Design a protein around this ligand. Structure first.
Ligand SMILES: *[C@@H]1O[C@H](CO)[C@@H](O[C@@H]2O[C@H](CO)[C@@H](O)[C@H](O)[C@H]2NC(C)=O)[C@H](O)[C@H]1NC(C)=O
Ligand code: NAG
Lengths: 50, 50
């Protein structure tokens, strides 16, 4: 299976390939959202995509 | 690494700073001759300072 980090990476690749560089992150208090938000922020910060 | 001796405008300014603000210094040259830019590293597709 795929961890939430790998699914987030695939989602970011999807957004990149279709030039959807403007997006919003909507999460609940459902378990695992902390790691999801942290990974999304870390990938965004260490990226040249913009 | 070899110990050479440095002097000039910046060294005089540093000596004046150490005289005014009481601290001691240990001067060493940067490994590469680059001032520093945010460059892509070929591992993890990240950006880092050199
Ligand atoms: C200015 O530099 C002198 C160094 O001569 C500092 O004097 C030292 O003071 C420290 C504690 O602050 C002592 O541990 C040393 O024994 C002192 N060294 C001697 C021989 O004076 C002095 O503290 C500095 N002025 C400041 C930053 O207050
Ligand atoms: C790839 O990166 C390593 C360190 O991450 C570096 O030593 C090497 O020179 C790089 N290769 C290049 C720039 O072609």
């Amino acid at each position: 299976g795929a961890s939430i980090q790998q699914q987030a990476t695939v989602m970011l690749k999807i957004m990149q390939d279709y030039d959807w560089h403007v997006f919003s992150l909507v999460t609940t208090i459902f378990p695992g959202y902390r790691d999801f938000i942290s990974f999304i922020k870390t990938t965004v910060d260490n990226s040249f995509v913009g | 690494t070899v110990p050479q001796c440095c002097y000039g405008f910046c060294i005089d300014l540093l000596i004046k700073l150490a005289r005014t603000m009481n601290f001691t210094y240990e001067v060493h040259l940067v490994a590469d001759g680059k001032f520093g830019t945010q460059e892509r590293v070929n591992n993890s597709n990240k950006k880092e300072w050199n």
